[PDB]
Amino acid sequence: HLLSLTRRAQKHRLRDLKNQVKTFAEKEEGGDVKSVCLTLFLLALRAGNEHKQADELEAMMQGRGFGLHPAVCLAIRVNTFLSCSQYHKMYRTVKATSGRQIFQPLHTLRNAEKELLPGFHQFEWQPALKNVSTSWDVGIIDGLSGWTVSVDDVPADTISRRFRYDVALVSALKDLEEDIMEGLRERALDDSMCTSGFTVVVKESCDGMGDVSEKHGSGPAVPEKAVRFSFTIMSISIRLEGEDDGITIFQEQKPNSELSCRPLCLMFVDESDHETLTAILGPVVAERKAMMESRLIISVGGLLRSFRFFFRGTGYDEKMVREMEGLEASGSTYICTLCDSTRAEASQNMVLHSITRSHDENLERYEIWRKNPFSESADELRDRVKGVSAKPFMETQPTLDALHCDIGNATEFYKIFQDEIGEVYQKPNPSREERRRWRSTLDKQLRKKMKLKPVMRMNGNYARRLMTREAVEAVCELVPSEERREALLKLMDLYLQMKPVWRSTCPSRDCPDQLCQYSYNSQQFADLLSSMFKYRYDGKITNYLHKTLAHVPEIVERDGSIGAWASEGNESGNKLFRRFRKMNARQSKTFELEDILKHHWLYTSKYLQKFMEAHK
Amino acid sequence: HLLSLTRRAQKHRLRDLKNQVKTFAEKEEGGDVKSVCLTLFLLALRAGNEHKQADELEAMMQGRGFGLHPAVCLAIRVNTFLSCSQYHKMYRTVKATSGRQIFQPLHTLRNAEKELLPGFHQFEWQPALKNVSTSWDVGIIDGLSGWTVSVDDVPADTISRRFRYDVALVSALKDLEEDIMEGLRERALDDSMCTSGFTVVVKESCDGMGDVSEKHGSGPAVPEKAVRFSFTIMSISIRLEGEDDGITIFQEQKPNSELSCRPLCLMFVDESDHETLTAILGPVVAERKAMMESRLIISVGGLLRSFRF
Amino acid sequence: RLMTREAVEAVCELVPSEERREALLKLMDLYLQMKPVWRSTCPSRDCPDQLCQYSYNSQQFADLLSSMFKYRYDGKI
DNA sequence: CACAGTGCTACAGACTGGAACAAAAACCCTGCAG
DNA sequence: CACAGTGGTAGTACTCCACTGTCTGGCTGTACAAAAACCCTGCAG
Numbered sequence A: 001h002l003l004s005l006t007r008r009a010q011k012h013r014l015r016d017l018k019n020q021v022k023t024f025a026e027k028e029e030g031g032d033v034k035s036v037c038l039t040l041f042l043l044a045l046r047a048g049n050e051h052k053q054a055d056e057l058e059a060m061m062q063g064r065g066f067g068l069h070p071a072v073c074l075a076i077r078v079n080t081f082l083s084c085s086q087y088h089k090m091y092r093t094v095k096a097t098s099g100r101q102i103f104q105p106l107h108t109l110r111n112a113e114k115e116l117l118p119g120f121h122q123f124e125w126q127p128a129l130k131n132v133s134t135s136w137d138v139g140i141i142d143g144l145s146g147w148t149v150s151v152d153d154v155p156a157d158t159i160s161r162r163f164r165y166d167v168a169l170v171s172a173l174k175d176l177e178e179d180i181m182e183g184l185r186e187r188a189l190d191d192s193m194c195t196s197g198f199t200v201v202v203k204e205s206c207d208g209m210g211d212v213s214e215k216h217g218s219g220p221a222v223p224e225k226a227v228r229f230s231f232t233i234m235s236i237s238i239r240l241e242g243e244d245d246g247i248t249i250f251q252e253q254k255p256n257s258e259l260s261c262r263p264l265c266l267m268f269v270d271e272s273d274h275e276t277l278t279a280i281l282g283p284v285v286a287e288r289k290a291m292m293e294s295r296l297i298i299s300v301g302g303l304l305r306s307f308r309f310f311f312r313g314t315g316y317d318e319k320m321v322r323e324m325e326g327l328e329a330s331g332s333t334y335i336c337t338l339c340d341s342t343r344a345e346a347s348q349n350m351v352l353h354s355i356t357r358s359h360d361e362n363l364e365r366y367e368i369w370r371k372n373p374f375s376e377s378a379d380e381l382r383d384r385v386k387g388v389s390a391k392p393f394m395e396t397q398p399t400l401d402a403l404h405c406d407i408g409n410a411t412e413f414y415k416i417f418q419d420e421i422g423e424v425y426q427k428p429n430p431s432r433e434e435r436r437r438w439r440s441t442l443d444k445q446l447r448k449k450m451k452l453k454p455v456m457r458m459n460g461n462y463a464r465r466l467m468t469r470e471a472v473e474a475v476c477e478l479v480p481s482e483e484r485r486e487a488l489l490k491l492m493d494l495y496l497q498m499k500p501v502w503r504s505t506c507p508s509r510d511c512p513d514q515l516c517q518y519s520y521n522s523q524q525f526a527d528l529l530s531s532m533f534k535y536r537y538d539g540k541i542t543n544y545l546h547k548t549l550a551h552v553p554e555i556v557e558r559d560g561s562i563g564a565w566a567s568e569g570n571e572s573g574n575k576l577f578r579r580f581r582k583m584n585a586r587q588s589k590t591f592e593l594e595d596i597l598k599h600h601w602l603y604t605s606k607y608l609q610k611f612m613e614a615h616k
Numbered sequence B: 001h002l003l004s005l006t007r008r009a010q011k012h013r014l015r016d017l018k019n020q021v022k023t024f025a026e027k028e029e030g031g032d033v034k035s036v037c038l039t040l041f042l043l044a045l046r047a048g049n050e051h052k053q054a055d056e057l058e059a060m061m062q063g064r065g066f067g068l069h070p071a072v073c074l075a076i077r078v079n080t081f082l083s084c085s086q087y088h089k090m091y092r093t094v095k096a097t098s099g100r101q102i103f104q105p106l107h108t109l110r111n112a113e114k115e116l117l118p119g120f121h122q123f124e125w126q127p128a129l130k131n132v133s134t135s136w137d138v139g140i141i142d143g144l145s146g147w148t149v150s151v152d153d154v155p156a157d158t159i160s161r162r163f164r165y166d167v168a169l170v171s172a173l174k175d176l177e178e179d180i181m182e183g184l185r186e187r188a189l190d191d192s193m194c195t196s197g198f199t200v201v202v203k204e205s206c207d208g209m210g211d212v213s214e215k216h217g218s219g220p221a222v223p224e225k226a227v228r229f230s231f232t233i234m235s236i237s238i239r240l241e242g243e244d245d246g247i248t249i250f251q252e253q254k255p256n257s258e259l260s261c262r263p264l265c266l267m268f269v270d271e272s273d274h275e276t277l278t279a280i281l282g283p284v285v286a287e288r289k290a291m292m293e294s295r296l297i298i299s300v301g302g303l304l305r306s307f308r309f
Numbered sequence C: 001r002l003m004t005r006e007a008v009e010a011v012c013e014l015v016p017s018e019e020r021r022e023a024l025l026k027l028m029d030l031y032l033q034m035k036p037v038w039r040s041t042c043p044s045r046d047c048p049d050q051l052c053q054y055s056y057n058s059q060q061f062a063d064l065l066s067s068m069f070k071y072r073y074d075g076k077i
Numbered sequence D: 001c002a003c004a005g006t007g008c009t010a011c012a013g014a015c016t017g018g019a020a021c022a023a024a025a026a027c028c029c030t031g032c033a034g
Numbered sequence E: 001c002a003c004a005g006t007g008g009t010a011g012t013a014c015t016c017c018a019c020t021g022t023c024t025g026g027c028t029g030t031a032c033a034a035a036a037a038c039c040c041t042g043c044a045g
């Protein structure tokens, strides 16, 4: 039987059928090799018909894959942290032994890639963007942006890589086309109609990172600290044709997750030195400023449609909020980024203030400090300008950061407990010896009951586990006085009562009663602090206690949320950055930022995360 | 446009084609429609096929797949550094789309390796070892080795784990059986005979490792530095019946590789202090010093054979 | 990477004196040529000549150390 | 003279196509053989 | 009131190893008509 001989062997057999199919291809199709054999064989198998093969023969060509489709292979490789070379190892293994290979080769995965990265879909900005090129196919650009490397100027030491802003925007926006059209159908809105009234709200974050080791390479020399600038799409809603203040279509269900945080720019720069950070990150701010005005026109769902963008920079820590706005940092006399009170007026009256600071007034105050029209002395001009000693570089929405606020308050209560173990308000001047002894007994008691090893620095998780009532009642037994016990216990209770207003995604729905009583509860909190703990809070408050006892109701009223705009998305993305610089990038100084950027853009797509569930 | 019409139009689109095919089958191959129509695709596609033509054509009734043996799946999982939960994610995704499931579930892998780990094969020493129990199924044993944790003594601040020496050795030797049999074959020495004089030379190594971060956990408090005792089978040779110092069979071609270094004991202990290190590592050195004397008996390649170390 | 010869060539350029520039290069040469005996897997096969010459080469290395670097290797080895 | 990778790029071998050839595998078929 | 994990164990839920008859859906030889959609041509502005 011919099924036992080689494929070369068969030469003599099928000559006449090849002649017949070549003659037949002319008169009806023109060269269609596939169909003339496909519809013949699939139907001739069903002549003596068992359906066992009818399933195998139906999906063989068109839908879907046969084997698993290349896009499914790409998703099951990116979303499980499989290195390319490990995947090729698995591919060879599953194919050579009993295959019938299922996965696709590497070079066809790499070909289904150029559709996901930016620089593939066409778009149009109306009107034309200001001092921004109109070419829509730019991929990964080097962040140096044309430095005249010549030796006599400032050196070009910094390596950097970045997409263009609008191109990554339109790609990460067209990726959500599935869910935007499904929201359009769910709300049952008109499709052909109401195409130009969309509105996008986008949270962007910035952050630095320490002790990133460096490599030998070939140069140039580079610092260890790395800086990562990334953005995330929070919500997309519709406006036309009337007032209809909000008609949401898509809202990110989990804004703090890794899976929704899109990297835009990576640098090997320190955060401290302003010169290099501003030189590299200048073009991004110019793109943002020129993009806030114009409207995007994108082909989605079969039709071209017009979008507008709204940016809210909220993912910055206080060090960077003060750097990017020129204020002095951070143990300064002026504690609040939003208000103008000094340390004294904020230890005196804790719970009454109003938000004033913004971008435009800070620019104008730098102008006043520089022109100095009244010939004032330095120390008093500083008070007249209220801490603006530098020109603001970038606009950030006036909001509080959740995670570092929780950490600040947890370190504050940890210091209070330490003071309490010993008697601090009887003997006001202790030594370092007794301080270390009190800290040691506090850590031993916390480890014995709460199951918490000591910490070098207060990370978020130790701050969630420390400020709970079990821990306080585990430290209440150490403090001998029976009145201080009740005091700090009611303090912890008030704090646990006011926490979910700021730490929740939407306090307006998940915890309305705690929202309604935040002002009064903070009043009682500050009253207990002023009364009983005055030995510690006479004239010195931390800047986070002020932010959380004065400005929280106004913040949650302005936008409607706090924790949903936290810096979690970037902080946690740093983990992905480290695991992608060690496992998935070329080991060289020249190329490796490009690989981390590409793989981290692929991990954070929605279209490749649709296949991880595959309808359960 | 030939994309989606039903049967009874392609019927008369290809009536003459199928009549000619049946005529050819009757003229030369008797008339077996299936064998003809299955082979029609081979040459028509192969004029220009990429590679997937051959795969989807060999996807015929033969093969076949139902999926790889669970051992191959286990090897893929332990050699691509895939976490168990990530592997289950891959399994669910590959079965839900177009499956036809290939990979095995987790619960059949968990019983698939019960042979590879120690404490499975039967073995016995002679003469019986000193100060070592004869149970041959001891798996992962806690290294503390019966410390009377009671408060007044020196406390047990150490979390450690270790395989017993003899059991991990007989499993690492029973695993290399393929290569020692193949060496006997290539060397053209008789397999059944002169099986009593083997000799196994084993390189052992001990090392510490700094700044292993501690966990919150329950207790007790533990230092951060860890110590990792491991060993590796360097070479195995034959001497019997004699006249040769040795006749080598298996020699590790890549001794320094990370693929050939078998861990034996893990501890959370500092290297500087001596009392904790020696109290944990007492038993290992004891049964090692007691093992150099006697000879091991294993059932390998079908027969009972004797080993020295 | 630093024990190779083309690396001693980048250092010999900073040393102003010439006799020392030759001395340290002769030292690097002797070392590159006695290293593979104890770094190789099986020196009895891959490099037999270096194994046969290790005694004389070590003698000469020690002689050069005592001669032109005595100020450092008087009593600390 | 650690060693298993770290991904992208480059070019080596595996394919067709008729022309035509040889060697071989093995049926069957004739010569010369008792 | 982050969040996606980390592997093992107990529990539920289901989907199957064998015996059995019965049932429907869909294959095959041409004949027979109803719809499909251009294209012709026919008669009219």
Ligand SMILES: [Ca+2]
Pocket: A207, A208, A209, A210
């Ligand atoms: Ca940081």
Ligand SMILES: [Ca+2]
Pocket: A207, A208, A209, A317, A319
């Ligand atoms: Ca920082």
Ligand SMILES: [Ca+2]
Pocket: B208, B271
């Ligand atoms: Ca050490």
Ligand SMILES: [Ca+2]
Pocket: B207, B208
């Ligand atoms: Ca060491």
Ligand SMILES: [Zn+2]
Pocket: A336, A337, A338, A339, A340, A341, A353, A546, A547, A550, A551
């Ligand atoms: Zn304020």
